[PDB]
Design a protein around this ligand. Structure first.
Ligand SMILES: O=C1NCCc2c1[nH]c1c(Cl)ccc(Cl)c21
Ligand SMILES: [Mg+2]
Ligand SMILES: [Zn+2]
Length: 313
């Protein structure tokens, strides 16, 4: 009850900032996560014994892949924490509870491969879930871990609050399917500009929480350049492995994913920043003005990728 988590002074200050890096000490990540829940939600939101049992089961079900790993899970949860803290009054108790947990669980049991590689491989998961293949699996894994004895962190909620929170988590996890992001952002763009966007409209909330999930999921492009550059390495290690496996299926991969065409990465990064990241953080800042530091940092990093192409580094 009276057991606060505290952080060292540097972490205590820096964790409030969008561009915080959770650092290389794995064993500190669970406490960083609990710290964020206790300040986003309250020291009352979860039975600490259950939360901790939940966190360690979630951690175990992330695999040892270069990018889609436990560190990504906590990095994306930290970004959602920063958005929630900078937008205190815009979200319900249930939404704050649900979204931090959604972020932690959003890539559960990721194998390092796209929905697209699953479909071409003819993976069992692609027969069970025709679209948002991995994202329907990640939600499935979340529910499975919630149903382990001692793991139902939501136990104290009413029957209908419970159904509300699991529906907040399903929509939020599904929304991390980047194929759904494009339409979701275009719809949010029109709604903001025609002035129809209404946060009391549940279907409008859903859209806005989806964009937040995309913004947190991509938050690697909003870090200080040295963090962004080294995380890009990790994402490309997965992309190249997947490119290799495409070749093994007798399919030339897009040059982005082909490890023989590493020279083309920077232009690929430019495209991704221009087509995905900048529009994502632009639309998010229009709707949630205090999220502007994410846009600014993303623009700084776009500028850094332009220097990479030019050969200035
Ligand atoms: O720079 C990146 N950081 C993490 C996220 C990310 C980055 N580059 C990407 C490309 Cl080219 C495609 C799809 C994603 Cl999710 C990408
Ligand atoms: Mg994912
Ligand atoms: Zn992710």
């Amino acid at each position: 009850g009276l057991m606060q988590f505290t952080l060292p002074v540097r972490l205590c200050k820096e964790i409030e900032l969008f561009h915080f890096d959770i650092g290389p000490f794995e064993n500190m990540w669970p406490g960083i996560f609990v710290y964020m829940v206790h300040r986003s939600c309250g020291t009352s939101c979860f039975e600490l014994e259950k939360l901790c049992r939940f966190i360690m089961s979630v951690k175990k079900n992330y695999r040892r892949v270069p990018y889609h790993n436990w560190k990504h899970a906590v990095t994306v949860a930290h970004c959602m924490y920063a958005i929630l803290q900078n937008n205190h009054t815009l979200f319900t108790d249930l939404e704050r509870k649900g979204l931090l947990i959604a972020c932690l669980c959003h890539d559960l049991d990721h194998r390092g491969f796209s929905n697209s590689y699953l479909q071409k491989f003819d993976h069992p998961l692609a027969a069970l879930y025709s679209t948002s293949t991995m994202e329907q699996h990640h939600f499935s894994q979340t529910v499975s871990i919630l149903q382990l004895e001692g793991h139902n962190i939501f136990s104290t909620l009413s029957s209908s609050e419970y159904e509300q929170v699991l529906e907040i988590i399903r929509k939020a996890i599904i929304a991390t399917d980047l194929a759904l992001y494009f339409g979701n952002r275009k719809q949010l763009e029109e709604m903001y500009q025609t002035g129809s966007l209404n946060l009391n409209n549940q279907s409008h909330r859903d859209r806005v929480i989806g964009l937040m999930m995309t913004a947190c999921d991509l938050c690697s492009v909003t870090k200080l350049w040295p963090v962004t550059k080294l995380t890009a390495n990790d994402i490309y290690a997965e992309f190249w492995a997947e490119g290799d496996e495409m070749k093994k299926l007798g399919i030339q991969p897009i040059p982005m994913m082909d490890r023989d065409k590493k020279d083309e990465v920077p232009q690929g990064q430019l495209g991704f920043y221009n087509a995905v990241a900048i529009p994502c953080y632009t639309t998010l800042t229009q709707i949630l003005p205090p999220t502007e530091p994410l846009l600014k940092a993303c623009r700084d990093n776009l500028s850094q990728w332009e220097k990479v192409i030019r050969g200035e580094e």
